[PDB]
């Protein structure tokens, strides 16, 4: 997260850290959202490679023991059937991970609230992006969970020539673009929490930013619109 601030520890309890094994050590690569005690929602491009993955819930500081963490392996990876790794702009950047064991829900670990199917947010709706991703373009990961206020930019405006143009689809959500705050590498797969009817719901899965950089004016961070995949998500969890 570029231009963010440290989140209160465990204030976004559904946020998870997706890590892969590199030799005898582990490295954070993406964010994700705990949607069931044994299911995590993340981006398809995060699990495109054949690596050994593990999920960490209740995490805050990646390098220190916070006394709230739970580590669990990944038993199954279900990528959306239309996902095309060579065309992130085509959409479908979403994947569901079945955890090897069910995590224990508590003060630091809770399920994320998903939107009702088809829900579209009005322009400039209040949302927050969270993650341990780079704090600057071509920079380094954040040690502690970061958050940044990132209001939405409706489709009509985001898909115009002044912003992303035809690179964005109606199956995506755009947020930010103020040139100061944005998601960045490492935030991928993470949530976009938006205030709807008094509660924060996960409306987006961080997908991509401009090749020019993370925080670019009129180049909002783009997210997979969760509300367009509710039926798919329910069908996978109900038959797997
Ligand atoms: Ca920690």
UniProtKB/Swiss-Prot annotation:
Disulfide bonds: 30-46, 127-194, 158-174, 184-214
Binding site for Ca(2+): 59, 61, 64, 69
Catalytic activity: Hydrolysis of proteins, including elastin. Preferential cleavage: Ala-|-Xaa
Active site (catalytic residues): 45, 93, 188
Protein location: Secreted
Pfam families for this protein: Trypsin
Gene3D superfamilies membership: Trypsin-like serine proteases
PROSITE patterns: TRYPSIN_DOM, TRYPSIN_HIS, TRYPSIN_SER
Superkingdom: Eukaryota
Keyword RNA-binding: no
Keywords from the named record: Calcium, Disulfide bond, Hydrolase, Metal-binding, Protease, Secreted, Serine protease, Signal, Zymogen
UniProt entry tagged with the keyword Calcium: yes
Gene Ontology terms: biological process: proteolysis
Enzyme class: hydrolase
Tissue: Pancreas. Basal layers of the epidermis, hair follicle and sebaceous gland epithelia (at protein level).
Record text on cofactor binding: Binds 1 Ca(2+) ion per subunit.
GO molecular function per UniProt: metal ion binding; serine-type endopeptidase activity
EC number of this enzyme: 3.4.21.36
GO cellular component entries: extracellular space
Domain Peptidase S1, first and last residues per copy: 1-238
Similarity annotation: Belongs to the peptidase S1 family. Elastase subfamily.
Record's function text: Serine proteases that hydrolyze many proteins in addition to elastin.
Protein name per Swiss-Prot or TrEMBL: Chymotrypsin-like elastase family member 1
Organism (species): Sus scrofa (Pig)
């Amino acid at each position: 997260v570029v231009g963010g601030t440290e989140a209160q520890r465990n204030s976004w309890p559904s946020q998870i850290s997706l890590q892969y094994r590199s030799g005898s050590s582990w490295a954070h690569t993406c964010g994700g959202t705990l949607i069931r005690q044994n299911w995590v929602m993340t981006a398809a491009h995060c699990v495109d490679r054949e690596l050994t993955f593990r999920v960490v819930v209740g995490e805050h500081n990646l390098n220190q023991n916070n006394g709230t963490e739970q580590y669990v392996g990944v038993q199954k990876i279900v990528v959306h059937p239309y996902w095309n790794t060579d065309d992130v702009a085509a959409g479908y950047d979403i994947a569901l991970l079945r955890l090897a064991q069910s995590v224990t829900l508590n003060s630091y670990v809770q399920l994320g609230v998903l939107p009702r199917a088809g829900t579209i947010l009005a322009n400039n709706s209040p949302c927050y992006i969270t993650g341990w991703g780079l704090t600057r373009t071509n920079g380094q990961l954040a040690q502690t969970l970061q958050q940044a206020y990132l209001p939405t930019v409706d489709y009509a405006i985001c898909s115009s020539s002044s912003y992303w143009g035809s690179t964005v689809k109606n199956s995506m959500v755009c947020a930010g673009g103020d040139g100061v705050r944005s998601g960045c590498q490492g935030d991928s797969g993470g949530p976009l929490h938006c205030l709807v009817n008094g509660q924060y719901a996960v409306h987006g899965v961080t997908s991509f930013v401009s090749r020019l950089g993370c925080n670019v004016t009129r180049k909002p961070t783009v997210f997979t619109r969760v509300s367009a995949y509710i039926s798919w998500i329910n069908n996978v969890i109900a038959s797997n």
